[PDB]
Amino acid sequence: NKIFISHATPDDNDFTRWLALKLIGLGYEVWCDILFLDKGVDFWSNIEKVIREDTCKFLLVSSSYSNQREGVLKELAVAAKVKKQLKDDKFIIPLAIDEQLSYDDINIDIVRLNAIDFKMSWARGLKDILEAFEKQKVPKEVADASKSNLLYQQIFLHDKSVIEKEEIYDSNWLSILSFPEELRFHEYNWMLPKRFDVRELTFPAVRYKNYLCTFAWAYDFTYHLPKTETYHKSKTIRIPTEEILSGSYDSNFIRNAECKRLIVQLLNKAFELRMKDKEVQEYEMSNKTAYWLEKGKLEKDKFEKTMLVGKQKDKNWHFAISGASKLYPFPVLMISSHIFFTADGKKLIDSSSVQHSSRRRQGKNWWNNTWRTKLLAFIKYLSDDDTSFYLEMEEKVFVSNEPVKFKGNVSYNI
């Protein structure tokens, strides 16, 4: 009732799996060794027993690998013995699948038999197999693809699936813990265009309708602008930051979204100034800016044994990060990783085409662990204390150096 398939176990599996599944889905009962995930030690006895007592046809995958394989030859000898015993002239059917193995090199037990040509087309070979099987009255049941689907799921799809295991992922978000109690709008009036540059001030501040909005005191700007030296504390509007972050502010004087945008602007400016304070090299991208270390800054560019500066062939590659504060869903700092290429130890390659090509050439061989370790080391270098680092706001804002972790209930097994 069964149909035995014999092949080279680790070499001709691509064709054998296809043929076995195709024949099983067509109603035929197929015995192939790769259909069992649990081969016993005494499997040869079972193979001989199934050849002697079960199989009605013996299909042999003829290839260069299987031409002189010892186990295949032993199976061929047993099949020949059963063929002589059973008085079946067409018990052994060779399926020629290899173009390299010429028809003049087949082994002695096969050189006399009529083979099925799978070299030019597998569909034609399967059509010939089915035509011979119906012509020779090989037993078969009704066609059912469910059997093929189930066997494919069980055998070739058992070690490749998800499992219910807990996993912890490290992100690039920097949750902000501490904020200044109040945000102040100082009514500086004109103040000589209120230092129209604004961006060159010592503290992050913005210009509202007729106020200077910042988290710092009024007298902190006396150095750049002396008009505040006489300005009194009466002309200011103090608002609570925590109330705004909770979506509580209202009224037509100011909108909650505008307040959040102003806070984002202040945080971005403060991050830029603090990152400048660290005395690192700055790269101006198309729509953002990144901060990278030079070749001679560290001893020796191996902070936390992770490496930060290296050489590809003749240039120097440097890891860099770009930060941007955000208030959705919670106040965090988006951190994005980048790589920059310098011809010398501390220089820059002016052309962007070479930089982009080298970046894409380098990124092909880094992967998750390298990216995570380099990002974590670069972000821990900037830490101003054990588990935080500060941005100037008197007041200041502290940001954790440990990115928020994520929990997952499923994962894989490598």
């Binding site: 599944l21 070299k119 690039n172």
Partner: protein
């Protein structure tokens, strides 16, 4: 420290009602739903191009292997998979002379050069379609690599060798929409990558380890273009219609416009997945604005609802509008003025701009595909790219990017939206791969828009995707 939720991998449907996750494996074991009898191919190009195409067609039939058959499944041959004939004997040749190509190739203006080459190919296409008695299912345009190199919008022709979009592919497919001819454009280096080498004596494109993947992609695209259905979704609900809206800039006119194209997917009463376009790109005269007018929004929704009713018999119960932009109040009010009471309108925004990256702590691989991070009742992250255990490799390159899926307008379950998107990611007929990142609605609306905004003289374009992809 936040938690994640896993979304099960969707199963696509194949012949004999057999479900599977991998399109390639399902095609290999069971086969396509349709029964094509054979593909009759028309080849256009120089004699070298015809020889290249014939050699590749002969090579396709024999089994093709990859470096790893676990990560990338092998190709057992065209007929063994699709059970239909695509042979080199059914080839119809329309020769294009190399001298004719060179007459138009070296020109000062890239617009004139691309127009002349595109017209040179299309004239032969239409002449063979009208004045020849043989039937051709798909026309295969073999293009020399010089034509590809020197017909790009920003390509420059070296000084020593010296409307409509200045792009060969988009202008080629846009000027063939009046005659409804499915076309497959190939480059000579794609099918003969061995014969084109660089200065170091090695091929520019290395397909040695991915030969079977190339065969899979090409064969699946050719089978779809000839009118066959390789697979379909299996778990999609009844009464819900998916819409995908994409805006594109039109530089053909003096005044810039934002043409909005759509893609529509749903289920018919015969359990077949109806996936097609929604065209007549509704323009906007304001530059930099990607929001539809009330009249154009009404027209779009009315056309979509009328098509659904004609194909089914009644208005859809639910409508989902996937868009890369955020709908505003006026456009949504215009949309709601067309829908009946029984139809629920949901407007979802799908973006890939939010920079959130999750690094696995103790491995060289990436986060599992299907993981989600529900931000709140209207916003979530979906990881459509990542490590797939079935192929033991990641779809991404270095670290996958997440999709920030937000239910901008209407009331719906966010988990259901994520499941619908992750099921849509399995319907890409332009490629034979595991599920890609973006949903098929947005991707195919983008593909439609890139062609409909090439040539202006498109009154009523066809809805089938074989004329665009």
């Amino acid at each position: 420290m936040k938690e994640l939720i896993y979304i099960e991998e969707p199963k696509i449907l194949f012949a004999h009602g057999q479900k599977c996750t991998d399109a390639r494996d399902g095609l290999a074991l069971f086969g396509p739903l349709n029964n094509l009898y054979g593909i009759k191919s028309g080849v256009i190009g120089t004699k070298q191009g015809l020889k290249i195409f014939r050699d590749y067609l002969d090579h396709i039939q024999k089994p093709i292997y990859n470096s790893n058959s676990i990560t990338r499944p092998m190709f057992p041959g065209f007929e063994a998979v699709f059970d239909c004939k695509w042979e080199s004997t059914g080839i119809t040749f329309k020769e294009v002379t190399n001298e004719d190509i060179g007459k138009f190739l070296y020109n000062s203006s890239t617009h004139k050069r691309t127009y002349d080459l595109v017209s040179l190919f299309i004239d032969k296409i239409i002449s063979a379609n009208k004045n020849e008695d043989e039937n051709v299912d798909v026309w295969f345009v073999i293009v020399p690599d010089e034509i590809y190199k020197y017909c790009r919008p920003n390509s420059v022709l070296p000084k020593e060798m010296v409307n409509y979009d200045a792009q060969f592919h988009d202008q080629f497919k846009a000027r063939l929409l009046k005659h409804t001819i499915p076309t497959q454009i190939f480059r000579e280096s794609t099918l003969a990558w061995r014969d084109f080498k660089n200065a170091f004596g090695l091929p520019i494109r290395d397909f040695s380890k991915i030969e079977g993947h190339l065969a899979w992609t090409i064969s699946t695209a050719a089978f779809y273009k000839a009118g066959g259905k390789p697979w379909k979704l299996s778990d999609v609900r009844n009464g819900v219609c998916y819409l995908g809206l994409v805006y594109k800039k039109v530089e053909k006119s003096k005044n810039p416009r934002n043409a909005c194209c759509a893609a529509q997917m749903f289920l018919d009463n015969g359990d077949g997945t109806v996936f097609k376009g929604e065209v007549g790109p509704w323009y906007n005269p304001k530059n930099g604005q990607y929001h539809l007018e009330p009249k154009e929004a009404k027209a779009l929704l009315s056309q979509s609802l009328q098509s659904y009713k004609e194909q089914i018999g009644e208005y859809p119960k639910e409508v989902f509008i996937h868009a890369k932009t955020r709908f505003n109040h006026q456009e949504w009010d215009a949309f709601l003025e067309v829908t009946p009471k029984e139809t629920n309108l949901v407007g979802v925004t799908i973006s890939k701009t939010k920079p959130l990256k999750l690094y696995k702590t103790e491995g060289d691989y990436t986060i599992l595909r299907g993981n989600a991070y529900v931000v709140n009742e209207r916003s979530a992250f979906l990881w459509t790219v990542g490590y797939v255990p079935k192929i033991q490799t990641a779809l991404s390159m270095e670290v996958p990017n997440p999709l920030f899926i937000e239910i901008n307008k209407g009331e719906a379950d966010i988990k259901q939206v994520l499941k619908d998107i992750l099921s849509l990611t399995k319907l890409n007929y332009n490629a034979c791969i595991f599920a890609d990142g973006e949903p098929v609605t947005l991707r195919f609306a983008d593909k439609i828009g890139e062609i409909l905004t090439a040539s202006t003289d498109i009154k009523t374009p066809p809805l089938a995707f074989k004329y665009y992809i």
